[PDB]
Amino acid sequence: MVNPTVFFDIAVDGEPLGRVSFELFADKVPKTAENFRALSTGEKGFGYKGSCFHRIIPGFMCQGGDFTRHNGTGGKSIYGEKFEDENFILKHTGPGILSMANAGPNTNGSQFFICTAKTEWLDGKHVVFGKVKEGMNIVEAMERFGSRNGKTSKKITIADCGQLE
Numbered sequence: 438m439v440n441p442t443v444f445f446d447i448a449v450d451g452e453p454l455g456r457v458s459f460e461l462f463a464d465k466v467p468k469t470a471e472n473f474r475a476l477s478t479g480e481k482g483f484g485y486k487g488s489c490f491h492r493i494i495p496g497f498m499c500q501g502g503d504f505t506r507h508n509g510t511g512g513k514s515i516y517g518e519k520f521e522d523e524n525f526i527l528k529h530t531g532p533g534i535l536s537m538a539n540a541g542p543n544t545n546g547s548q549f550f551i552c553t554a555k556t557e558w559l560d561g562k563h564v565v566f567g568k569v570k571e572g573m574n575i576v577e578a579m580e581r582f583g584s585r586n587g588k589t590s591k592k593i594t595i596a597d598c599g600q601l602e
């Protein structure tokens with residue numbers, strides 16, 4: 438039935454910032470939503486708890502999910518391999534959209550980004566699979582620690598994460 442909700446508790450240099458929660462569009466992109474959900478609960482033995490947002494570009498997006506190499510070169514899905522672009526039904530319409538980062542067609546792993554603006558040029562290239570439900574203000578606060586080239590000025594971490602309800 439109803440789409441799952443997951444949360445991230447964000448810290449900045451180890452200090453609590455706040456919680457961001459997401460609605461995952463399992464009704465439209467079930468395989469992609471499931472990967473992110475499971476990575477958020479940690480139920481497979483690995484996932485996002487303790488990982489960082491390693492690339493944040495103000496006015497554009499905050500990117501994370503590289504829990505293996507911590508820098509954009511790693512991550513892994515729950516499927517034992519990278520997975521296909523499920524569909525491109527949903528578009529990058531504005532702030533708060535949750536979408537998969539990738540290195541080309543059919544290469545989804547665990548990396549994802551949260552848009553801070555409408556990023557329509559990514560439509561058909563990145564699978565949109567959720568949106569911020571609560572704590573977009575916390576994403577805005579994280580965005581302030583980014584820079585033009587994406588390097589963050591403080592370490593932005595997922596101190597805790599899980600599924601709500």
Ligand SMILES: NC1=CCC=NC1=O
Nearest residue numbers: 498500538550559563
């Ligand atoms: N070009 C990009 C697309 C999505 C997330 N991060 C990027 O740097």
